[PDB]
Amino acid sequence: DVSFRLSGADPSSYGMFIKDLRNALPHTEKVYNIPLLLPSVSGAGRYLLMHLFNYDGNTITVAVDVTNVYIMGYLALTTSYFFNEPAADLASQYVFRSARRKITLPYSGNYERLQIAAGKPREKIPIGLPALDTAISTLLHYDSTAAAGALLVLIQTTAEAARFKYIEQQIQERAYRDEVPSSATISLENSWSGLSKQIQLAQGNNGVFRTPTVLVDSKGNRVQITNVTSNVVTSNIQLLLNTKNI
Numbered sequence: 001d002v003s004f005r006l007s008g009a010d011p012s013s014y015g016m017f018i019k020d021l022r023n024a025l026p027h028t029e030k031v032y033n034i035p036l037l038l039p040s041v042s043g044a045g046r047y048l049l050m051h052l053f054n055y056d057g058n059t060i061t062v063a064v065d066v067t068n069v070y071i072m073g074y075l076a077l078t079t080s081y082f083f084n085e086p087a088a089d090l091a092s093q094y095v096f097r098s099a100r101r102k103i104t105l106p107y108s109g110n111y112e113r114l115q116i117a118a119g120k121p122r123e124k125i126p127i128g129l130p131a132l133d134t135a136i137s138t139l140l141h142y143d144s145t146a147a148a149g150a151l152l153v154l155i156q157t158t159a160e161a162a163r164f165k166y167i168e169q170q171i172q173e174r175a176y177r178d179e180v181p182s183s184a185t186i187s188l189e190n191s192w193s194g195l196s197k198q199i200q201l202a203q204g205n206n207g208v209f210r211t212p213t214v215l216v217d218s219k220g221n222r223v224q225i226t227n228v229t230s231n232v233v234t235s236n237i238q239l240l241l242n243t244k245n246i
């Protein structure tokens, strides 16, 4: 399990939480010095629990699939909540079993569905540590529209930050003031699966991508990633989705 407390939080404590989250995801192999997430895990060991506390000390526990860093659901007091998708229903067999009641959210966890339910794309949703405090507070008592937006914040400030150093740093900049995600942030989120695949395929293609990945850099400019000597690979990406899950 990993924990994060918004009360007294600063860029340093958030970084320690993201480090903890990365370290809780198992791997047997690194590919170009980046941990390779496992193809599969059986039973309850497939799920990591994150304990998040809002500024007031109230808490949710979030269940994360350790093979892909996908949030499956969360526990708020005695009620569990899960995404409307097969992987999450499976997860509900193993975590939060002692909840008095289980609600299936009226959407899956994919970004496009969540944005529809929330009423806005995440280009327009401010993120940061104050937004995460708000998200935790929202998820404490059920409200499916509010929850969709809260979940978009939660996913980007936990899972996406775990995957990319740049995104972690973006959230650190927003420790005390929310701001919509940078164009590079959205680009990286969208490209994780693509990048994970091309990095694994580069193991037998001399570090060369079979298919180049187009990204936006720290300044809105549309660039092509063609090999493992790229910044994105050497410095930024921190976890690889196993190609067996792509």
Ligand SMILES: *[C@@H]1O[C@H](CO)[C@@H](O)[C@H](O)[C@H]1NC(C)=O
Residues within 6 Å of the ligand: 208, 226, 227, 228, 229, 230, 231
């Ligand atoms: C590989 O990527 C580097 C760094 O982005 C770039 O400068 C170079 O042009 C690329 N080289 C090849 C052979 O793809």
Ligand SMILES: CN(C)C(=N)NCCC[C@H](N)C(=O)O
Residues within 6 Å of the ligand: 069, 070, 071, 072, 083, 085, 087, 088, 108, 109, 110, 111, 155, 159, 160, 189
């Ligand atoms: C990290 N996440 C949540 C995202 N970037 N989107 C990936 C797909 C979501 C998945 N269905 C889920 O269960 O979370």
